[PDB]
Design a protein around this ligand. Structure first.
Ligand SMILES: CC(C)S[C@@H]1O[C@H](CO)[C@H](O)[C@H](O)[C@H]1O
Ligand SMILES: [Mg+2]
Ligand SMILES: [Mg+2]
Ligand code: NA
Ligand code: NA
Ligand code: NA
Ligand code: NA
Ligand code: NA
Lengths: 1011, 204
């Protein structure tokens, strides 16, 4: 029947979907969420053999272990075991587009397991098996006999094995197809893998049992009263003596209980559900759930006889919360949310798409530590444990159907075709049936990037009708279609419209107010964190704060999808698209996260944490005004620490208790200060600290901070007089300057400082020259490629203009002697095929004290593309261990991504001045620097810089970090000016105009000295 | 203004004067102006200006030079934005070209006198035998800034001896969203801390 080539067939013999069950036979156990003797894990060592196509599978396999198979761990993705390659493709499908067909060469995974079943499981009741995740389709046999089939790689498939099993040893056989008609709805931008990658379990339920249960919570106007309503359904034989008891617990206290025999209210002319019952429990002053205070209750549903014998019990965590949209705003418990979200794919660098508790918890804590309060399940239902963790640690979740058909032309080709409605429908309905009782799920999503088709409207309506407690969203077809309650664009900019035909992306500020529009707007994806990115993040936050109906967004995305590979010598390295021979592939586009695959943070994460702070601040005189953005909690685990420092030198500091109500303000009057002992800038830095540990953070955790410049004392006092006087030696090829143990050589043919000595020690490996380019960031490259240039990409614009190839032509090199210094004057023109791109005019002035002051005035042709930077570069002979600077830090920061950095005196190991982006580029800049120290050197002025063992050339010539090699000495790039990094998207120029170096004329000045 | 330094140096082909001044108030240093004046074999005087503005002082209305020229000439000719008066936040209608008007048109007779007549993005200004080249903003008239300040009605103004020239490297916006609370947008305030500009003055 080739069922995997027919969208009309998505399963055979599969049982209905339902919320998490465990069939406890002890109420207390269900109450406490302890393990259940009736829910067994079959995860562990199984047998596995790979085949190139289903037809190659031998019938003998059905009854006998194949001797050639191997023993492997399940769950797992077979690509991570090396059986075949995982494929990284973004939009274009990994198989020829010819629905509903798939390639005849279709990798097939033959999994099997020999296991035992207790006789008690067979003597009574029903035993079923549950596959939490099988990618992408499979047939199942038990003891040589066929059981059924299932599709949808991201929801559990269950089969009743009661009639197939025997007491003792049994053998399951699972034939998993890599490609199926289900693949057409699984075109998400991520590695394409396959296998039994989620848990396998066996669940025993009684013959007469709880088949489904739904819990709802409704409130009064002020949330001081609720009604919990539990609809319970059964399967099995009805008896008058049967009963259902629902009880609700708050910790160890039972808050309420109700019991009733089965038999629902009349529904229509034919009656009601004899097989159902709904219990209603009143709850006074309920403890409300939110991401701020995730209060939870436990509802236990007991199926039993009137005489009191327990049949079974099921249960779930309940969070009392109301989600509703009113007057254009998304409200939680009556208050308007500000979504600090992130999109998070299920990805592990070693295990592929297999998720484990430890990694989930890791993710959650880091999210919470970085001020996120929400997550979008991009773009499929997640492993069941995720929801339990979100409910308990407190995160707002967008649960999304596993439907993405991005590679179709047009995008809604399948979604508008009624033949695909059935397959789509199950991907939505079975999700709702599994997840509807989780308080953390506040919004349902119909999927992603599948245009807008009539199937979406019908499914939008199905959800609205079955579960009115949560809004429905869907971005396809222009983000504001009839299939969404929320305008939820992806990559719409703050102020800039992108008026694409049919599906424009308007400025989010403007979108809200289009004629007739009234919905709230929350970006489903924004601030594409690919590589050196997050430029302009603050612009979003500012808008979110100011506009009530701009309720936030979900950053794209949490973690880089890089995978571990091992070099010849067993050394692991980070791999991306194409790295497994996969072709066609989309290269580094699978890496877009705020953290590297191992969860180490990228520098942008700190920018996010900062902009997503929950406390806002204002300064007036000596008064600090703190405003809380919490909606429900008081700041009961927070104090404010403040410090004043003069150019990095500590002056005064202290702490104060924060006692601010949600949405309230607190005024803190700072003490009088002992004003600076001299010149410089005084800086005030405040940090909110949580003295006590929480479930998600350690004691002393820093949740927010902010700085302000206070008094500045301009220096007017002249340095003393150095009797010492520098001397000038002239030759035809060089100008030399000597001052005691110091010397400087300027090359007359080049016009550059070629060498410097301290004593007899040479200081430079390469001369000090202007630099107007940078090894391109991923945002600079966009989708451009050598075989498919995108002329619009910044990198192509700079290349085309000759920026990377321009050569310096000397126009002037002169030396003069002053009263107390030597003055060298140079001028160079950088040209390309006749055009003058840039002009750099400088003076170097060496005085009696051995300080070299460099003045630089650059002209940039108004018609050449704006340069990536205006600076100087050189390779220093020395390699020192630390780098110390007075400027913004300590982490890497760029013009459009420096809000989170703070001005102070920082000092780090040289290696931390390099950011290890998997795809290498210009990195590690620190801006607003007034002083830099390295080895015996000192540079003063107002510049940006980076310092590391890699030349810009090497960074741009190398595609993978593991391949970089530390060069001799240290490369120093000191910029008077540097272009923003952008990031609103990574496929079109995204650096805002105010961050492009379009001034035409630029000036900067630096002092270089040795200590 | 408090002189911090004033030195002269002879170069191969020029004389170089370096100066530094401080403006202070009640002991606080408001601004520091550091300059060089390089006079070459061609009679051209190149003035380089670097100013520091204390971050805690209110952003200044302008960062420029001023002087009263002995010369009173009939016309003003410039290569820059015009022909009418334009300020940083109000210069979109002005056009870059070569303009030439009679001196009195470089003064705008607001009933209540104030700073007026500025022209921005100028690369060349010519008046009488003088020529100024660079990238600056300027106003030129027979009324000193002091006199404009001190006079409440236009009909009470008196041409001063000579011509007052205000050449600015930077000028603050004029605002106007309202005329009863500060209305100049942050991007038109001179809050950079450090400013640089360069002018070359020559004759005919
Ligand atoms: C490359 C764009 C044309 S589509 C863009 O690609 C991104 C790559 O990370 C994400 O997958 C976005 O969701 C998708 O819209
Ligand atoms: Mg099928
Ligand atoms: Mg996609
Ligand atoms: Na808002
Ligand atoms: Na991607
Ligand atoms: Na507190
Ligand atoms: Na590179
Ligand atoms: Na006046």
């Amino acid at each position: 029947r080739r069922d995997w080539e027919n969208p009309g067939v998505t399963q055979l013999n599969r049982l209905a979907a339902h919320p998490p069950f465990a069939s406890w036979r002890n109420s207390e156990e269900a109450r406490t969420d302890r393990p259940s003797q009736q829910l067994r894990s079959l995860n562990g060592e199984w047998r596995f053999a790979w085949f190139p196509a289903p037809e190659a599978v031998p019938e003998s396999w059905l009854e006998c272990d194949l001797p050639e198979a191997d023993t492997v761990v399940v769950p797992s993705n077979w690509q991570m075991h090396g059986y075949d390659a995982p494929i990284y493709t973004n939009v274009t499908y990994p198989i020829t587009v010819n629905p509903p067909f798939v390639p005849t060469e279709n990798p097939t995974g033959c999994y099997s397991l020999t296991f035992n079943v207790d006789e008690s499981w067979l003597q009574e009741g029903q035993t079923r098996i549950i596959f939490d995740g099988v990618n992408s389709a499979f047939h199942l046999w038990c003891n040589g006999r066929w059981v059924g089939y299932g599709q949808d790689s991201r929801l559990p498939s269950e089969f009743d094995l009661s009639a197939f099993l025997r007491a003792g040893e049994n053998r399951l056989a699972v034939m998993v197809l890599r490609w199926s008609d289900g693949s057409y709805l699984e075109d998400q931008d991520m590695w394409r893998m396959s296998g039994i990658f989620r848990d396998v379990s066996l669940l025993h339920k009684p013959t007469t049992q709880i088949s489904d249960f739904h819990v709802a919570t409704r409130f009064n106007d002020d949330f001081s009263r609720a009604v919990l309503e539990a609809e319970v359904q059964m399967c099995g034989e009805l008896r008058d003596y049967l009963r259902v008891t629902v009880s609700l617990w708050q910790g160890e206290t039972q808050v309420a209980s109700g019991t009733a025999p089965f038999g629902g209210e009349i529904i229509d002319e034919r009656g009601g559900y004899a097989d159902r019952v709904t219990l209603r429990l009143n709850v006074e002053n309920p403890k409300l759930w939110s991401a701020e205070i995730p209060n939870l209750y436990r509802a236990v549903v007991e199926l039993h006889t009137a005489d009191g014998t327990l049949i079974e019990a099921e249960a779930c965590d309940v969070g009392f919360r109301e989600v509703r949209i009113e007057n254009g705003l998304l409200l939680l418990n009556g208050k308007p949310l500000l979504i600090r979200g992130v999109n998070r794919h299920e990805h592990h660098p070693l295990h592929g798409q297999v998720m484990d508790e430890q990694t989930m918890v890791q993710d959650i804590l880091l999210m919470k530590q970085n001020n996120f309060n929400a997550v979008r399940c991009s773009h499929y239902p997640n492993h069941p444990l995720w929801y339990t963790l979100c409910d308990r640690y407190g995160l707002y979740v967008v649960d999304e159907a596993n439907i993405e058909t991005h590679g179709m032309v047009p995008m809604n080709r399948l979604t508008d075709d009624p033949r695909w409605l059935p397959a789509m429908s199950e991907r939505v309905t079975r999700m709702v049936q599994r997840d509807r009782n989780h308080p953390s799920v506040i919004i349902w999503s119909l999927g992603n990037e599948s245009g807008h088709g009539a199937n979406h409207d019908a499914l939008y309506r199905w959800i609205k009708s079955v579960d009115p407690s949560r809004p429905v969203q869907y971005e396809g077809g222009g983000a504001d279609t009839t299939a969404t309650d929320i305008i939820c664009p992806m990559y719409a900019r703050v102020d800039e419209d992108q008026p694409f035909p049919a599906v424009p992306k308007w400025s989010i500020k403007k979108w809200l107010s289009l004629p007739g529009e009234t919905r709230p707007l929350i970006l489903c994806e924004y601030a594409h964190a690919m590589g050196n990115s997050l430029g302009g993040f603050a612009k979003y936050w500012q808008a979110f704060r100011q506009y009530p109906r701009l309720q936030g967004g979900f950053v794209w995305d949490w973690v880089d999808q890089s995978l571990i590979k091992y070099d010849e010598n067993g050394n692991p390295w980070s791999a991306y698209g194409g790295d497994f021979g996969d072709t066609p592939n989309d290269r580094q586009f699978c890496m877009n996260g705020l953290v590297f695959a191992d969860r180490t943070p990228h520098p942008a994460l700190t920018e996010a944490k900062h902009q997503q702070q929950f406390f806002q601040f204002r300064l007036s005189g000596q008064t600090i005004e703190v405003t809380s953005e919490y909606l429900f909690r008081h700041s009961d685990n927070e104090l404010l620490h403040w410090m004043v420092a003069l150019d990095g030198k500590p002056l005064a500091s202290g702490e104060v208790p924060l006692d601010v109500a949600p949405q309230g303000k607190q005024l803190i009057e700072l003490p009088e200060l002992p004003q600076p002992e001299s010149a410089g800038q005084l800086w005030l830095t405040v940090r909110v600290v949580q003295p006590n540990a929480t479930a998600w953070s350690e004691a002393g955790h820093i949740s927010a901070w902010q700085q302000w410049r206070l008094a500045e004392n301009l220096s007017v006092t002249l340095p003393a007089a150095s009797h010492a006087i520098p001397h000038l030696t002239t030759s035809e090829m060089d100008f030399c300057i000597e001052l005691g143990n110091k010397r400087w050589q300027f090359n007359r043919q080049s016009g550059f400082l070629s060498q410097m000595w301290i004593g007899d020690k040479k200081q430079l490996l390469t001369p000090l020259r202007d630099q107007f380019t940078r090894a391109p960031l991923d945002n600079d490259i966009g989708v451009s490629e050598a075989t498919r240039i995108d002329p619009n990409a910044w990198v192509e614009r700079w290349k085309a203009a000759g920026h990377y190839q321009a050569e310096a032509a000397l126009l002037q090199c002169t030396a003069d002697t002053l009263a107390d210094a030597v003055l060298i004057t140079t001028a160079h023109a950088w040209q390309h095929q006749g055009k003058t791109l840039f002009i750099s005019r400088k003076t170097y002035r060496i005085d009696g004290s051995g300080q070299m002051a460099i003045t630089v005035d650059v002209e940039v042709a108004s018609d050449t593309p704006h340069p990536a930077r205006i600076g100087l570069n050189c390779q220093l002979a020395q390699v020192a261990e630390r780098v110390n600077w007075l400027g913004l830090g300590p982490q890497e920061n760029y013009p459009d991504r420096l809000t989170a950095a703070c001005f102070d005196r920082w000092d780090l190991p040289l290696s931390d001045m390099y950011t290890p982006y998997v795809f290498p580029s210009e990195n590690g800049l620190r801006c607003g620097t007034r002083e830099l120290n390295y080895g015996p050197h000192q540079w003063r002025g107002d510049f940006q810089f980076n310092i590391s063992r890699y030349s810009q050339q090497q960074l741009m010539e190398t595609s993978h970090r593991h391949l970089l090699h530390a060069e001799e000495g240290t490369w120093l790039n000191i910029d008077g000016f540097h272009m923003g990094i952008g990031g609103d998207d990574s496929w079109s120029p995204s650096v805002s105009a105010e961050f492009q170096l379009s001034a035409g004329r630029y000036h900067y000045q630096l002092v270089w000295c040795q200590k």
